[PDB]
Design a protein around this motif. Structure first.
Motif, PDB file in Angstrom:
ATOM      1  N   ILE A 253     -22.693  -1.668  -3.754  1.00 39.80           N
ATOM      2  CA  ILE A 253     -21.840  -1.717  -2.574  1.00 39.80           C
ATOM      3  C   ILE A 253     -22.412  -2.728  -1.594  1.00 39.80           C
ATOM      4  O   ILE A 253     -23.492  -2.528  -1.048  1.00 39.80           O
ATOM      5  CB  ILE A 253     -21.702  -0.339  -1.904  1.00 39.80           C
ATOM      6  N   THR A 254     -21.673  -3.818  -1.415  1.00 43.40           N
ATOM      7  CA  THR A 254     -22.039  -4.930  -0.555  1.00 43.40           C
ATOM      8  C   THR A 254     -20.941  -5.160   0.479  1.00 43.40           C
ATOM      9  O   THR A 254     -19.759  -5.157   0.139  1.00 43.40           O
ATOM     10  CB  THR A 254     -22.253  -6.227  -1.376  1.00 43.40           C
ATOM     11  N   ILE A 255     -21.325  -5.342   1.740  1.00 45.98           N
ATOM     12  CA  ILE A 255     -20.371  -5.770   2.750  1.00 45.98           C
ATOM     13  C   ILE A 255     -20.285  -7.285   2.628  1.00 45.98           C
ATOM     14  O   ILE A 255     -21.247  -7.991   2.893  1.00 45.98           O
ATOM     15  CB  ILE A 255     -20.779  -5.355   4.177  1.00 45.98           C
TER      16      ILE A 255
ATOM     17  N   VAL B  63       0.837  -1.206   0.000  1.00 46.68           N
ATOM     18  CA  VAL B  63       0.000   0.000   0.000  1.00 46.68           C
ATOM     19  C   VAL B  63       0.877   1.264   0.000  1.00 46.68           C
ATOM     20  O   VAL B  63       0.598   2.228  -0.714  1.00 46.68           O
ATOM     21  CB  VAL B  63      -0.966   0.005   1.199  1.00 46.68           C
TER      22      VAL B  63
ATOM     23  N   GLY C 112     -10.318   7.745  -8.749  1.00 48.20           N
ATOM     24  CA  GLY C 112     -11.590   8.446  -8.793  1.00 48.20           C
ATOM     25  C   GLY C 112     -11.686   9.681  -7.899  1.00 48.20           C
ATOM     26  O   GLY C 112     -12.758  10.248  -7.753  1.00 48.20           O
ATOM     27  N   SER C 113     -10.564  10.102  -7.321  1.00 49.26           N
ATOM     28  CA  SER C 113     -10.567  11.230  -6.373  1.00 49.26           C
ATOM     29  C   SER C 113     -10.134  12.527  -7.032  1.00 49.26           C
ATOM     30  O   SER C 113      -9.540  12.497  -8.097  1.00 49.26           O
ATOM     31  CB  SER C 113      -9.649  10.934  -5.187  1.00 49.26           C
TER      32      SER C 113
ATOM     33  N   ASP D  10      -8.596   2.202  -7.409  1.00 51.23           N
ATOM     34  CA  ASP D  10      -9.824   2.787  -7.937  1.00 51.23           C
ATOM     35  C   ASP D  10     -10.215   4.063  -7.183  1.00 51.23           C
ATOM     36  O   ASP D  10     -10.612   5.070  -7.795  1.00 51.23           O
ATOM     37  CB  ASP D  10     -10.968   1.770  -7.870  1.00 51.23           C
ATOM     38  N   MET D  11     -10.086   4.020  -5.854  1.00 51.51           N
ATOM     39  CA  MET D  11     -10.389   5.170  -4.996  1.00 51.51           C
ATOM     40  C   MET D  11      -9.464   6.361  -5.274  1.00 51.51           C
ATOM     41  O   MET D  11      -9.919   7.505  -5.405  1.00 51.51           O
ATOM     42  CB  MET D  11     -10.297   4.774  -3.504  1.00 51.51           C
TER      43      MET D  11
ATOM     44  N   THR E 154      -7.940  -7.644  -4.285  1.00 54.70           N
ATOM     45  CA  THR E 154      -9.167  -6.846  -4.271  1.00 54.70           C
ATOM     46  C   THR E 154      -8.995  -5.518  -3.511  1.00 54.70           C
ATOM     47  O   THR E 154      -9.437  -4.457  -3.971  1.00 54.70           O
ATOM     48  CB  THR E 154     -10.314  -7.675  -3.644  1.00 54.70           C
ATOM     49  N   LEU E 155      -8.370  -5.584  -2.338  1.00 48.87           N
ATOM     50  CA  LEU E 155      -8.150  -4.392  -1.531  1.00 48.87           C
ATOM     51  C   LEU E 155      -7.194  -3.425  -2.214  1.00 48.87           C
ATOM     52  O   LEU E 155      -7.441  -2.221  -2.246  1.00 48.87           O
ATOM     53  CB  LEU E 155      -7.615  -4.770  -0.152  1.00 48.87           C
TER      54      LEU E 155
ATOM     55  N   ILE F 104       0.777   4.045  -2.999  1.00 49.67           N
ATOM     56  CA  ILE F 104       0.380   5.427  -2.690  1.00 49.67           C
ATOM     57  C   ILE F 104       1.498   6.367  -3.103  1.00 49.67           C
ATOM     58  O   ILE F 104       1.246   7.407  -3.697  1.00 49.67           O
ATOM     59  CB  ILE F 104       0.039   5.621  -1.199  1.00 49.67           C
TER      60      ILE F 104
ATOM     61  N   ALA G  30      -9.068  -1.837  -4.983  1.00 50.29           N
ATOM     62  CA  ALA G  30     -10.011  -0.829  -4.510  1.00 50.29           C
ATOM     63  C   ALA G  30      -9.279   0.486  -4.194  1.00 50.29           C
ATOM     64  O   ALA G  30      -9.781   1.569  -4.495  1.00 50.29           O
ATOM     65  CB  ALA G  30     -10.766  -1.319  -3.295  1.00 50.29           C
ATOM     66  N   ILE G  31      -8.095   0.388  -3.599  1.00 52.41           N
ATOM     67  CA  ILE G  31      -7.292   1.587  -3.328  1.00 52.41           C
ATOM     68  C   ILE G  31      -6.918   2.306  -4.618  1.00 52.41           C
ATOM     69  O   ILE G  31      -7.046   3.528  -4.720  1.00 52.41           O
ATOM     70  CB  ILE G  31      -6.018   1.242  -2.531  1.00 52.41           C
TER      71      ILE G  31
ATOM     72  N   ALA H  46     -12.113 -10.100   2.105  1.00 54.97           N
ATOM     73  CA  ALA H  46     -11.621  -9.770   0.771  1.00 54.97           C
ATOM     74  C   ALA H  46     -10.162 -10.198   0.674  1.00 54.97           C
ATOM     75  O   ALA H  46      -9.475 -10.250   1.694  1.00 54.97           O
ATOM     76  CB  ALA H  46     -11.767  -8.260   0.472  1.00 54.97           C
TER      77      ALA H  46
END
Ligand SMILES: [Cl-]
Lengths: 473, 474
Positions: free
Chosen positions: B53-55, B31, B75-76, B71-72, B64-65, B35, B68-69, B60
């Motif tokens: 959005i499903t918990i 990570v 998309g920021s 993608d986040m 996947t995690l 970053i 997601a980072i 995960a």
């Protein structure tokens, strides 16, 4: 160009074209290596620590900065220590740590959609999903808030605005005092909120709680009748699902039925106990919560999300537009989303959705169900340890992984029990390296166990009772 | 028992005895490396980005995690892009990123001393030093809040409690409406605060601002007199040091003097402009702030601390115990410190003091003075550019590194000006990779530059005006 000048350190910011990549990588790695060393070796630091501020003219050295971090870490409480069993404050999930690293790095702002394009949308959708786990229905939703006090504040502000139409003219015109009801064991953020909302701390009327610290519905009904008689204007009942001191859960269905009968907003402060929605074995304890007008829920407690992470959920999220949002032009995006700042107490807000979303996925619903089970198991061992010892007394039955108890030893008069328990707490911490909290409850000092650390074991609980046995003889 | 399970990933938590040390180090490192790649290459991403959005039941995977980072981040919004010149939202200081990593790792709680032994003391001492830098005197101090809106809320709650003795009985019995005064340019968190406090949004009486968006003292005196003649009860004047839209600073000494003449609480909302205390060349702009009863200040804006970082300061910090704190036993440590949850709006609170303190030390007062000066130079370059182009108009004189301006082309009627400016803003973003914001101001749409990114250059401003010239047919 300040970042070329002799007036800024070369690593003050991260060059967006990579020109200081190596230097920042080095500084970042030092902090990362140090924090990981402190955390992978957390059991080397006790649960509580043993202990001239000026802003410098010139840039501090890397050495000074790393030393400050080292001192900050060493002087901080350490919930990671398996001995830390005293507060609703857990060691953080690894992805919550990492989520906040990502959040700070991109530094988006939850104030508005254009300042947080993906996070605003993620937060709105995730909170709809969570409101669904609580059973609130298809219109439900909410916002993340920086702590549960703000969630309760915003719930109470909406209840007030709905009852008194007070968004524009305020509440100073009222002839009858608005009041709310809450259990005598409910959280102090109610009185602080009542103060903030212009109702005054005394507007929070305490309802008798049973010996097991659950609100008494018969007394709720009595206080409402009494309030009306005194010419007051009740507008909200707060039921608590996991009280802060003893961890007990109010009878939500019964309390909610009474609120609805009297036209009162029904808020459930589920800051702690709301996490049971992830446990099929335990969520029946929240029966009645699905009909709440609002819910406060704090993932930073029983979902192990690094502080702060809390939300307020509304069964009809549109109420935030009718009885909260201040008059202003309404600009909704083409995909339906709204600026979150307009419908929260806060404007600018840290993106807590990153750590929350990342932690929820890494642990999963089954992961939380298992953690929740282990919590209850540890607590039941404490309950049994207390039952076995006639000089100890339970506060009452437990509803969550929280056990409040105290010494009531017959070799001392009552007036000396507070010193005995303070002394036991001190001894457990000093010699046992075991941290219990010591709240005031029912006019006395009680020991309080919150069994949250994933690495707390049966042996830690047994070590505690052995120290207690030594202290008492 | 849970961490010894199939049901929990080996890295869900960090084993305090080191038993998952290697797996944790690798996950953290992936990570960290991702970053850093995103930030050291931030200029590769535009200033703005281009279910269900499903918990999940099960844990995960790491892949996947990490995705997601990715993608986040992608998309920021991207304030690190040199083209991001439109909001009071900066790329973060390196040490503020690292500070939040440290804060989340130890996960202490500012609610009470017991829960933040070091951070509570560091916060109390640091804000006393900062309050002293604002010249508030020996008794001054305050608390960090999660955002400036809360700082404003708390300051107004105290003004209210002092005037109406409302901590315990509330304000519902009052026969006269409590009101406050603020510039017609002042922040909307005043109205939201007023609503929250039970005063109603309408309790915020707007005071006329000049053509340069500074509060008019004569109109302030008139509005106070009118309020009293209208049966209302004035209790607070809010002056603004760096208005959100145009960045202007109310005449703090004159407004303070008028507040004091009428016996009203003097609050200065210095959320943005308070950073000038770190600039010897520019801090005279805040003259008069030293006599405020309270100050709101947001390091998250012009001191580059990653959000959120804000404070409310009181010239008499003791006021928080007399006119805010709820009745309760007063627990006080032997070295003098108090549980900060009792004297803040928030209870539990993230430890913002970590990134604030590390950032202040790394950048220093010299560093901020340089950052601030370069902001003014970029702003002055925008002002000059606007002045050279007859079809553009400045909102007025600038007080900070913010310039609000707009097209008023004589080849369109005035009712088409909003569309012209919206089209220009959209063209700058798409073609120029330059982000300006577009607030409503004075009933129209205005372009707004906030020159905060330390990597924003003269070349960027030049590119902006090149695009502007092309759009208007030179
Ligand atoms: Cl935060």
């Amino acid at each position: 160009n300040a970042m070329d000048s002799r007036f800024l350190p070369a690593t003050a910011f991260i060059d967006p074209e990579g020109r200081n990549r190596n230097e920042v990588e080095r500084l970042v790695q030092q902090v990362v290596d140090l924090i990981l060393a402190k955390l992978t070796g957390a059991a080397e630091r006790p649960p509580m620590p043993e202990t001239p501020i000026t802003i410098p003219e010139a840039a501090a050295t890397e050495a000074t900065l790393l030393q400050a971090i080292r001192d900050m870490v060493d002087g901080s409480m350490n919930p990671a220590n398996p001995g830390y069993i005293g507060h609703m404050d857990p060691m953080p999930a690894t992805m919550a740590i990492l989520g906040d690293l990502v959040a700070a790095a991109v530094n988006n702002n939850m104030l508005s959609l254009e300042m947080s394009p993906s996070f605003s949308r993620l937060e709105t959708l995730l909170l709809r999903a969570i409101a669904g786990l609580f059973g609130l229905g298809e219109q439900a939703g909410g916002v993340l808030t920086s702590g549960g006090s703000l969630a309760n504040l915003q719930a109470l502000a909406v209840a007030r605005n709905v009852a008194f139409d007070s968004v524009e003219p305020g509440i100073t015109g009222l002839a009858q005092r608005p009041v709310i009801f809450a259990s005598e064991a409910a959280h102090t953020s109610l009185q602080k909120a009542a103060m903030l909302l212009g109702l005054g701390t005394a507007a929070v009327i305490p309802v008798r709680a049973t010996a097991d610290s659950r609100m008494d519905p018969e007394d709720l009904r009595a206080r409402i009748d009494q309030a009306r008689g005194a010419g007051q204007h009740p507008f909200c009942v707060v039921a608590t699902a996991g009280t802060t001191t003893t961890g007990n859960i109010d009878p939500l269905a019964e309390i909610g039925a009474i609120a609805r009968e009297h036209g009162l907003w029904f808020h459930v402060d589920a800051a702690y106990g709301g996490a049971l929605v992830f446990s099929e074995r335990h969520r029946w304890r929240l029966a009645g919560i699905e009909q709440a007008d609002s819910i406060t829920f704090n993932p930073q407690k029983w979902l192990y999300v690094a502080k702060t992470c809390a939300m307020v959920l509304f069964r009809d999220a549109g109420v935030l537009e009718r009885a909260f949002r201040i008059p202003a032009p309404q600009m909704r995006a083409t995909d339906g989303f709204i600026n979150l700042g307009e419908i929260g107490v806060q404007g600018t807000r840290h993106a807590d959705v990153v750590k929350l979303w990342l932690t929820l996925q890494h642990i999963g619903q089954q992961g939380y169900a298992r953690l929740i089970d282990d919590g209850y198991r540890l607590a039941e061992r404490v309950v049994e340890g207390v039952r076995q010892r006639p000089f100890l007394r339970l506060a009452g039955e437990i509803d969550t992984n929280i056990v409040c108890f105290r010494g009531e030893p017959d070799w001392l008069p009552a007036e000396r029990w507070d010193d005995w328990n303070a002394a036991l707490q001190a001894l457990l911490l000093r010699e046992g390296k075991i941290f219990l909290s010591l709240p005031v409850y029912r006019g006395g000092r009680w020991l309080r166990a919150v069994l949250l650390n994933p690495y707390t074991t049966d042996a830690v609980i047994d070590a505690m009772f052995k120290q207690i046995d030594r202290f008492a003889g």
